[PDB]
Amino acid sequence: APPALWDLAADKQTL
């Protein structure tokens, strides 16, 4: 879950 936390938190730069 921690890796998926940081994984989903990069969508702000991704958008």
Added chain:
Amino acid sequence: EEERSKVDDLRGTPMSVGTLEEIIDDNHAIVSTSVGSEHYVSILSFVDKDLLEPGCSVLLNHKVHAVIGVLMDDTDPLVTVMKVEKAPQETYADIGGLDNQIQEIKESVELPLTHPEYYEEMGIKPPKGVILYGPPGTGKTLLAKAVANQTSATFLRVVGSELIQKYLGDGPKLVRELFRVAEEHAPSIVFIDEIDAIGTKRYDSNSGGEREIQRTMLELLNQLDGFDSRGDVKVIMATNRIETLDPALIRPGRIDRKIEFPLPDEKTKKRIFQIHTSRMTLADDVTLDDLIMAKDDLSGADIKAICTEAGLMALRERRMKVTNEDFKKSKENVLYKKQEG
């Protein structure tokens, strides 16, 4: 928490089901969805981007063809042809006389997996499968063997030439799906029986050809040979006729193990009749001696079928118990039945 209420808006509410075509190292992946839609999508979310691989389902957010995640969905027909299950009731203890016939193959299937100590410590390791054969119409008589192997480990049965040359091939690619999917479910066992790919003659529908059936058998060999797959998926093969089978099979596999199916003897025949009549109540005058002596070279399901018709006429008289006279005439329906045909 907040991420669940964030990424859903971007990927929500609708999103197309797309197919990954190929991957560019930019994190941009060339994708495909109906119809002829290619694109570049760089996302860091839900991925797993390594394990995606082309030819798989990737989600596609309508703005614009963006992938929020991936869903692997099967199903597939061939996954349905594997199970279920049976976990069948038929032990190898329900059959008799082949204890020496079986004991080896019983080892070679339970020598690995269950009880590995002697096997792995010995550094020998022959898990290349087995091969069976037997006359005249047995082999499912050896599915009374494999039916005990269906009681352990993981299993899929694929038997008969029909599933090979059916329509125009595409050659082995069905055999490819079998091998690779049985490698995906590994450990497992694939039971082949009655390989008539050369023994059958007519191409189903419009198909060709004899050599392309021979080359799809050939690639069956190479995929079993093989370069280079250590996956197991053990392979059990059987047939009626070992003559038409090409030796190209045997040296790669199965090179070490193949069993011969003998026809039962007096005590084996009697044993089997006792096995099938164990359930059925029979009249006090039923005698097995004149039966096993009068009959000639019958396997289990033959005398099991005379038990079946004996109970059939026993139900025509609505008796729960079969009479020896009706057992000899009801028998005479199969005796005359093989004498009529």
Added chain:
Amino acid sequence: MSGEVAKEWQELDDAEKVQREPLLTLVKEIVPYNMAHNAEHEACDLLMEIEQVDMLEKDIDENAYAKVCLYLTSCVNYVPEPENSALLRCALGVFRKFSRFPEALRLALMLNDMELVEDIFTSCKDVVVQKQMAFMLGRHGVFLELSEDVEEYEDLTEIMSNVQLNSNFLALARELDIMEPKVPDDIYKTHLENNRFGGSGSQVDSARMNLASSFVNGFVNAAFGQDKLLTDDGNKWLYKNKDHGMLSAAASLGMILLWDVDGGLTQIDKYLYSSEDYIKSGALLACGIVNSGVRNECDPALALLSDYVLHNSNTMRLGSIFGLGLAYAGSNREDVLTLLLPVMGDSKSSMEVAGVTALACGMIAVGSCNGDVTSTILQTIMEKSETELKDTYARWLPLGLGLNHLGKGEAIEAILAALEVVSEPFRSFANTLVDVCAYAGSGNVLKVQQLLHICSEHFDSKEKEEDKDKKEKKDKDKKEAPADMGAHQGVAVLGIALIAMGEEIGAEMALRTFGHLLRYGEPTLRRAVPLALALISVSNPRLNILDTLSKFSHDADPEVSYNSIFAMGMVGSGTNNARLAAMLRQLAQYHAKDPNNLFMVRLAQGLTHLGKGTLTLCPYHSDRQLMSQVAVAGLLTVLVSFLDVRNIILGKSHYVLYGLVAAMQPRMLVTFDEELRPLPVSVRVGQAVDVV
């Protein structure tokens, strides 16, 4: 009542009501009830019976009648006197029931014997008496449970039994002690330092001196430092005065060095002379350590090393003068006569000038002391102080002491700590970090209290971080560290090295917190996180390391790319794989500038093998072609002429196998030290680390 066909309760506890009066009866009335089948209250009568056979001191029958019970034997009749009375009578009387054959069959951890001696051993270890059957019986399974929570530093002791019972005694004690911070391997680290572990250490192979070949010869020739062969030298009573021939690591490093030549080796003439046609590379960086580890011992390239580095250019002198003493010192002693002469010969005024050779004799020491080199290093650094000063050389000096001896009486920390007054917070990070941590392993709890009070005074507001880090260093894996991270400062470097070193245990078990600190941690601390991959990963790096860091690898951040490729780094260089060599592709196809690119790829080259080859084994042509084709770029971009030597540092060095370092469970001191500084890699810190 006990035999009434009625199943009505209860036949338990009723013997306390009327007690003396039923004692006018015996078990004779009881036996027809329990022996006759299809009778009521079969095992229930044993709840009354265990007390009569227990108060009569009978043994294995209380065992036999507590089998289905499993409960009442705990709370049973109170005044402690009959309880420790029939407890020690039952105690000495149950083991005499055991091993009666003789020589096993051993009990026969079962729910009868072990759960009952555990059950009553509860009350045994609660208040009264001591030394139960555990010392009487001989069961190590209950000996696992004999001990109660207490400091184990004292528990190194046991009853001396025969070496027969001592062997499996020591095996089950070992596997009992592995989870535990302290292991029988403690003889290495500890300190201790009393003569007991050397006495028993040479007595474990006493008295046989022939089959003693293993654990003795391999131990004296596998030792780089002098302490084990020294204390053990006084503790090795085989012969007299001529055991010193197999000691001092002269014939040791000679023999193992010629067996390494038996299992090598590295190319000399072709590569190094074809490189001598290229004159001097522009890196002035990694080329000296080549002739350091390579040669070993030969003089001719040593005068090229020296006579060159007389020019003084940069710190390029470093690996060169390191080959000066490493060459002859490869076996012994050596060069420590002329090793330190350039120190005072070359005010420094900095490390790259007179500090390089000042590092030389300290690191080339490797077991000295002896004891001259100790007082010689302390003296020579007390000569140059204001020119050192507190910063650039003081980084490397304690590495010439603490390596050889942790409990060394000499304090060079105080004399080097009088120079702290310069007040600069910056350089004292990487300076005072392993400056103060590198003096000794200590273990006294007093040292860091001293240096915290005299150093701090106050406090440095900065160094205090590294000082509690030095404390947490002093002790090893005491489990005190998970209690020391509760601070978890906004600095947060407490937690990273605190979990790094704070747990040394075979089972990782640190995944929960190691992931919890990155998932819960503040930003940019995850940059520090992968650096803990150095210690705990010695077991199974393959699965988890390239897993996690594989995601950290293609991150655009050069800091987590750098500290990632290091995070794998050496612990990921233990063995090779097709994933590594295949992954090297397009790691080197990136268009990014800066040294992080070829530290990523070129450090990722050294993970293919370590000190192995080339003759024997893997071919050197493929490395020649890879480093030859990748260097076509830039064109210079001198860092390519730095990388081509970078891979062959470890590549063509050889002559040392690691393995790990080390198999004995010590740790390399230059590696953690040096790898902590370039985390913010800037100018010469990378070459200071390039001492390696």
